Structure formats: structure tokens, C-alpha cells
Design a protein around this ligand. Structure first.
Ligand SMILES: [Mg+2]
Ligand SMILES: [Mg+2]
Ligand SMILES: [Mg+2]
Ligand SMILES: [Mg+2]
Ligand SMILES: [Mg+2]
Ligand SMILES: [Mg+2]
Ligand SMILES: [Mg+2]
Ligand SMILES: [Mg+2]
Ligand SMILES: [Mg+2]
Ligand code: NA
Ligand code: NA
Length: 753
């Protein structure tokens, strides 16, 4: 299995290394035969002799064109003749490329800035992370001595924790008497011991959380300070930093440094990306945070070091588990995109699409178009649903609408307005013509992807190993997203295969096929379409029973799919006993077993009191389970009355809100801050991350001066602000739903007093 590739320089020539793990053993294969190159299109072939003599200087040495070769490749759908320019070293290209381009005889150059080791994987047809090999992983974390107003890593590393399948352990240089703690004399011995642990376990993957920007940088400075050869690379190298645009990344040669931070940042939306928040999100269970001042205070006083050690062990432990959780998906991605997990784990959707497409282009001998220049980048810059309760609803939607359009109409930059074609398809509204005589670059590669996905689904059934099936499932699911990412690519201003006409033709066709499908089902099968969005719609036959609606649905799908051209296909996605539709993106349905599914409506954040969430839930089931609007309305009115009668348990009024800044550097951004400041004033430790839990009390002033921490609420003396909970919690939770039935907030309570 291929893990990574790079190059070293040997007598001024590149030596590709391919890092592999085969039959449970690490191996480095060398290849000295591969040569840097890019392409030039010239006005007069004759000028090649001048172009061959162009030179530049890198460092203090002369850079020349090593050799040239006339080649034939596809550009804009047609065979073209271009000159392949070879160079001695990859770093020659940035030095000489602009001098070649600037030559008068040179029209343009192409494929001139692909990183050498990534070209290698492409041009040789190699794919990372392919095979049955099992990777050995090791997570690690550190805890440091922090003092505000100090330079970075001025203080020592206090603890290094690490976790793999054999458990988690902590290394530290003060005595902590715990079974999972290994005590050593000094920081230096700690670090050295950690090196021995890594070298002896020899993992293929090192997992961190934010190691790209903190852990390895800290370790680096401390190792400089202490004169330690931090030789974690399997070739004896030290971790190497790469500039990752705004910040940095770190490689450990011969291994994969999997930093979870960027992976998780893109996979899940959260307000905060602390390790504790991410571990609760993913695994559903809190993780306790020990703050930096407590760590430093513990080290200084010698007291509560066991608490520090446990936090350190847990950092490593949860980092490992998160790695176990996210890495297999990123590995399948890496295999499908054909680039290393190191690169893929840190790459935008954009970058990943381009790498896939560059490979396809190499595989089809198509000359890649160029990223736009800044002048070009500048150039590249409805229907409310039916109201009310519906019953016996079917959801029907297209299979891979945008890909399927692209395939069907052969939509591609290289097919657009092709001259002298005998057959073209014409985009609605926008009018762009796409030639059908020859399959386009994008349509052909998308057809292959959609096919492989169906082939993968076929094998998933023919398999029992649930693991193998999950890995097949990941690949299948990744292909679908890649297919849609290809569609987005055509509309993206920085894309190589940009094609604005392609993008706007695809969406135009989509609207035509959706709207036509809706027209047929209503006119020719008596359905009423309740709600539609882009690539699907809900409908019913008003007054029909569930079986009629299903049967007619299946008959319509047959009719429409026969009429639909090519790959366009509508499918039965589900049946729903009842539902309602507030607006685009906001709706609620219940299936025949009782399972409610909602979208755009449910009240989630912990900024909502339980009474709000509970009431909204009860409304939704009165609407969906009972089809009873008046009952939903009675529930609300009854809740708001109970509030006013001080009958709602105080535990259902509690609002929780996290402190984000120093209570000094705040925004007067709510009652949670006022409570925080009073606590601070009494001498309570408030930090970013402190959760404040409060109840709002009746009286005058902003809620702020009136709210109090839940643990101080005593019903025998305190009266909560029934009005606040009615008007600012309960009613806002239900108003959007019940507006869809003609009710305004004031219609859902008794009159104020
Ligand atoms: Mg750490
Ligand atoms: Mg080793
Ligand atoms: Mg770092
Ligand atoms: Mg090296
Ligand atoms: Mg990473
Ligand atoms: Mg895969
Ligand atoms: Mg690739
Ligand atoms: Mg579908
Ligand atoms: Mg309630
Ligand atoms: Na390939
Ligand atoms: Na024809």
C-alpha cells in the first residue's frame, strides 16, 4: 500500500521516494528515472530552437531547458501539437517558466506548477491507500507550562501523552502516582522517552489535534533548546513544516501525520472546536477540560497533578478514538482522489476536484487548461409550498440530477459551441449548444464514476464482512459527492475546467426537467404537488387512500422515466402519512410507522429552555400524529397559562450559555454575561468555556440585571418571569410552525395583564 511520495535531490537530480507498507513492513522504493516537465504551445515550430536556448538562474546556477519533444494531446476537444519541455530539477520550473512564457514565439505554457511528487503519482497511475494492509496508528498530545506574557514555548513541556490500541499513557518529570504514568527525571528525558516509544511502536500514522500548529512547533523549540535530535521520520529526519497558506502543516517522513483539526472543522459545524466540544459532538459524552492556569498552578504547588495527568491521558485517548473514527473515510477519499492522505486531509473540496480531474486528464491525454490569471478571475465574478396539512404524501426525486444532465446533454467546456458538429443539444433559456458527436471530457469521466458507484452497490449486497461493506459504502458515498463536486467545479471562478455556460445550462435544464415532471404528474395523473425544491417534490392525490397514491405513483414513475431522456431518472424516495410545509427548506413529515422527520424548524440550541423545546415537540406531534391544529393551539395556550400560574418546574426554565471572551472584553451580549460578572465579582473563576446556567426573574430592568444562576433559585422566595418565558421562549419556538396555519403569536396566549 502506498502511503506517501516525495523527492530528495541527489547530485542536483530528483530522486522520487515512494513510501510503502507491504506485508506488514515499511519499505522505501526509489525512482531516479522521472523527469520534471511542462508544455508550451508555439506560434512557429521553428522557434523551438530559440526557446530551447532560454535560460534562467536559480541560486547561483544556470537553469536550462534539458530537452524537448513534440507531442500530440487533446485541447478543447481537438488534437493539438504541443512541445514537452523537460528540466533537470523540479525547482527549475518556477525559475524559467516566466522567461519561456515571455518569449514572443510562445503562446502559452501549461501544467507548469504541479508539485513533482504529485505529478509522479498521476503519471505512473499509482494510487495511495490501496490494498488490504492495516495501518498502525498512534495518537499523542502534550501539556505545557504556560505563563501569560511569555514567548511561545518559553516554558517546558510538562507531560507527553500517547494512545494506541494497547491503552493510553502519560510521560512526565514530576511524580504522579497513577497506573498509566511513567515518571522520568527531566523534560529532556521525557521527550527522549517519547521518541523511544514512537520508534519502538513504529506507527504508520501519528494522530494529533492541532499538531500542525501547536504540538510539533512546541516540541521543535524545546528540542532546539535542549539539543535533541527529534528524529521522528522513518528515514531519521525531523518533522518538516509546510506553509499551508495562512498557517502551517507538518509532515513526518515515512509516516502520515493526520491532524484531526482540519478534517473535523470541515466535516462538522460547531461553535467551538476545542477537543472537548468535538469529542462530545462525535461520541455524545462530555470530556472535562483542565485549563492552562490550573495546569501551571498544579505544577507549581505540586497539588492536583493527578488531575493534570488524567486530562493528559484523556487528550491522547480521545484523539486516538477520533482518529479511529475519521481516518478510514479520509483514506477512502485519498484512494478515490489519487493523492496522499496527508494532502487530502488538509485540502479544500476545490483542490481535491482539480487533483481528480488532473489525473483523468492525464489518463485521457487531455492538456489541462490553466488556472485563471487575475484579469480572468475578475471576469468570472422560488415558489412557496402549499399551506395546510396534507396526507398520503410521496416524495419523488431525481437520481444525481446535475451529473445526469451533464452526461445526457454532453455538457463540457470542450463540447460548448463546437463548430461543424452534426448534432447538438440546446440549453433552455440560456441557449448554449453542446456538441453530441464526441463525448466530452466531463461527461465521460462522470459516466464512469456513476457506473462504478452502481458496481460498488452491487458488490455491497454480495458481501457479508460488514467491515468490507462499510469501506465499500464509504467509496460509493464519496463518488456521489465527487460527481456533484465536479458539477460545482464548472461554476467556480478559480477552477481549471471552469465553464460558466456549462454551469448555467445544467441548472436551466434542471429547472426544465423538474417543472415538466411536475406538470405531467398533475395533468396526467391527478396529483397535486405540494412542495418542490431543485431535484424533488412531495405530492399526493387529494382524497385518495395510501395504496392508491402508491400505485399511481409507481405508474407515473414508469411513464415519466420512459419519457425522460438518457440518464435522467425520477425515483420513489418515500411515503408519509402526513406533513406540512412552511416554506422553502422548512417542513415536517411523519411516516407510516410514526417516525417524524423535520427540516428547518426544530429548536436545537441550549439557548432554548426545556419548556420551549418540549412545547414545540408537542405541537409537532399534534399536527403530524393527530392532524389536529386546534389541539396544537390548545397546548400552547395551556403552557403559557401554566407559566403565568408559576406551575412550570424551574428546571424547565434553565438557559445555558457559554462564556466566549473575558467578561471585560465583552459585547454586553446578554444576561449570561451579567450573571457571569456578578459571579466573577464574588470571586468565582469565570473563563472562556465556563457555562452559565440561569433563570430569568420577574421585575424591571434588562433580563441581565434580573437573571440569576440556577443553583441559587429557590421557589419559596423567587418568582420566575412568566412573561419572558412566554414571549421570548415558548411563543417564538412555535410561531413559525403555527404561522403556516394562520396564527399569530398573540393568538396563542391569554391576554396580558
Ligand atoms: Mg496537545
Ligand atoms: Mg520507527
Ligand atoms: Mg505545530
Ligand atoms: Mg527526509
Ligand atoms: Mg490532517
Ligand atoms: Mg475509495
Ligand atoms: Mg490525482
Ligand atoms: Mg435520489
Ligand atoms: Mg410543553
Ligand atoms: Na490514474
Ligand atoms: Na445528424
Amino acid at each position: 500500500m502506498i502511503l506517501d511520495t516525495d523527492y530528495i535531490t541527489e547530485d542536483g537530480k530528483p530522486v522520487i521516494r515512494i513510501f510503502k507498507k507491504e506485508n506488514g513492513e515499511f519499505k522505501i522504493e526509489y525512482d531516479r528515472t522521472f523527469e520534471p516537465y511542462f508544455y508550451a504551445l508555439l506560434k512557429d515550430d521553428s522557434a523551438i530552437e530559440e526557446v530551447k536556448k532560454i535560460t534562467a538562474e536559480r541560486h547561483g546556477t544556470v537553469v536550462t531547458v534539458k530537452r524537448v519533444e513534440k507531442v500530440q494531446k487533446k485541447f478543447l476537444g481537438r488534437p493539438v501539437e504541443v512541445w514537452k519541455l523537460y528540466f533537470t530539477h523540479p525547482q527549475d520550473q518556477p525559475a524559467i517558466r516566466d522567461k519561456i512564457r515571455e518569449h514572443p514565439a510562445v503562446i502559452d505554457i501549461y501544467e507548469y506548477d504541479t508539485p513533482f511528487a504529485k505529478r509522479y503519482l498521476i503519471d505512473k497511475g499509482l494510487v495511495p491507500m490501496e490494498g488490504d494492509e492495516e495501518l498502525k496508528m498512534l495518537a499523542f498530545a502534550i501539556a505545557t507550562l504556560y505563563h501569560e506574557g511569555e514567548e511561545f514555548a518559553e516554558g517546558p513541556i510538562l507531560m507527553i501523552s500517547y494512545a494506541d490500541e494497547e491503552g493510553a499513557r502519560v510521560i512526565t518529570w514530576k511524580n504522579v502516582d497513577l497506573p498509566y504514568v511513567d515518571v522520568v527525571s527531566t523534560e529532556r528525558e521525557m521527550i527522549k522517552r517519547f521518541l523511544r516509544v514512537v520508534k519502538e511502536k513504529d506507527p504508520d500514522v501519528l494522530i494529533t489535534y492541532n499538531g500542525d500548529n501547536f504540538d510539533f512547533a512546541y516540541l521543535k523549540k524545546r528540542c532546539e533548546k535542549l539539543g535533541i535530535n527529534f528524529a521522528l521520520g522513518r528515514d531519521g529526519s525531523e518533522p518538516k513544516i509546510q506553509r499551508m497558506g495562512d498557517r502551517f502543516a507538518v509532515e513526518v517522513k515515512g509516516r502520515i501525520h493526520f491532524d484531526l483539526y482540519p478534517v473535523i472543522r470541515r466535516t462538522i459545524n460547531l461553535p467551538t472546536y476545542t477537543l472537548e466540544a468535538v469529542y462530545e459532538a462525535v461520541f455524545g459524552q462530555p470530556k472535562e477540560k483542565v485549563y492552562a492556569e490550573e495546569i501551571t498552578t498544579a505544577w507549581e504547588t505540586g497539588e492536583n497533578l493527578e488531575r493534570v495527568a488524567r486530562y493528559s491521558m484523556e487528550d491522547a485517548k480521545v484523539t486516538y478514538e477520533l482518529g479511529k473514527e475519521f481516518l478510514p473515510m479520509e483514506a477512502q477519499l485519498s484512494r478515490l482522489i489519487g493523492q496522499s492522505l496527508w494532502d487530502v486531509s488538509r485540502s479544500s473540496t476545490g483542490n481535491l476536484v482539480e487533483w481528480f480531474l488532473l489525473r483523468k486528464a492525464y489518463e485521457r491525454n487531455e492538456l489541462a487548461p490553466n488556472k485563471p490569471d487575475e484579469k480572468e478571475l475578475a471576469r468570472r465574478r422560488v415558489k412557496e409550498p402549499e399551506r395546510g396539512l396534507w396526507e398520503n404524501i410521496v416524495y419523488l426525486d431525481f437520481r444525481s440530477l446535475y451529473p445526469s444532465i451533464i452526461i445526457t446533454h454532453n455538457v463540457s467546456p470542450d463540447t460548448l459551441n463546437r463548430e461543424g458538429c452534426g448534432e447538438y443539444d440546446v440549453a433552455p433559456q440560456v441557449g448554449h449548444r453542446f456538441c453530441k458527436d464526441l463525448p466530452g471530457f466531463i461527461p465521460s469521466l462522470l459516466g464512469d464514476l456513476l457506473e462504478e458507484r452502481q458496481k460498488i452497490k452491487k458488490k455491497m449486497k454480495a458481501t457479508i464482512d460488514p467491515i468490507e461493506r462499510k469501506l465499500l459504502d464509504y467509496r460509493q458515498r464519496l463518488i456521489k459527492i465527487l460527481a456533484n463536486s465536479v458539477y460545482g467545479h464548472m461554476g467556480f471562478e478559480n477552477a481549471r475546467w471552469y465553464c460558466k455556460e456549462c454551469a448555467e445550462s445544467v441548472t436551466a435544464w434542471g429547472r426544465e426537467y423538474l417543472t415538466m415532471t411536475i406538470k405531467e404528474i398533475e395533468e396526467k395523473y391527478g396529483f397535486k404537488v405540494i412542495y418542490s425544491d431543485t431535484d424533488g417534490f412531495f405530492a399526493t392525490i387529494p382524497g385518495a387512500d395510501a395504496e392508491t397514491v402508491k400505485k399511481k405513483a409507481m405508474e407515473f414513475l414508469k411513464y415519466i422515466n420512459a419519457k425522460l431522456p438518457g440518464a435522467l431518472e425520477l425515483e420513489y424516495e418515500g411515503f408519509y402519512k402526513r406533513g406540512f410545509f412552511v416554506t422553502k427548506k422548512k417542513y415536517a413529515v411523519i411516516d407510516e410507522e410514526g417516525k417524524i422527520t423535520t427540516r428547518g424548524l426544530e429548536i436545537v440550541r441550549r439557548d432554548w429552555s426545556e419548556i420551549a423545546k418540549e412545547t414545540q415537540a408537542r405541537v409537532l406531534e399534534a399536527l403530524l400524529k393527530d392532524g389536529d391544529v386546534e389541539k396544537a393551539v390548545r397546548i400552547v395556550k395551556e403552557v403559557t397559562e401554566k407559566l403565568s400560574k408559576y406551575e412550570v418546574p424551574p428546571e424547565k426554565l434553565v438557559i445555558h450559555k457559554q462564556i466566549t471572551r473575558d467578561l471585560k472584553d465583552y459585547k454586553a451580549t446578554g444576561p449570561h454575561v451579567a450573571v457571569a460578572k456578578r459571579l466573577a465579582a464574588r470571586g468565582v473563576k469565570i473563563r472562556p468555556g465556563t457555562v452559565i446556567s440561569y433563570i430569568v426573574l420577574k421585575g424591571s430592568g434588562r433580563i441581565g440585571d434580573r437573571a440569576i444562576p440556577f443553583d441559587e433559585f429557590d421557589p419559596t422566595k423567587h418568582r420566575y418571569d412568566a412573561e419572558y418565558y412566554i414571549e421570548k421562549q415558548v411563543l417564538p419556538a412555535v410561531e413559525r410552525i403555527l404561522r403556516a396555519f394562520g396564527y399569530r403569536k398573540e393568538d396563542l396566549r391569554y391576554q396580558k395583564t
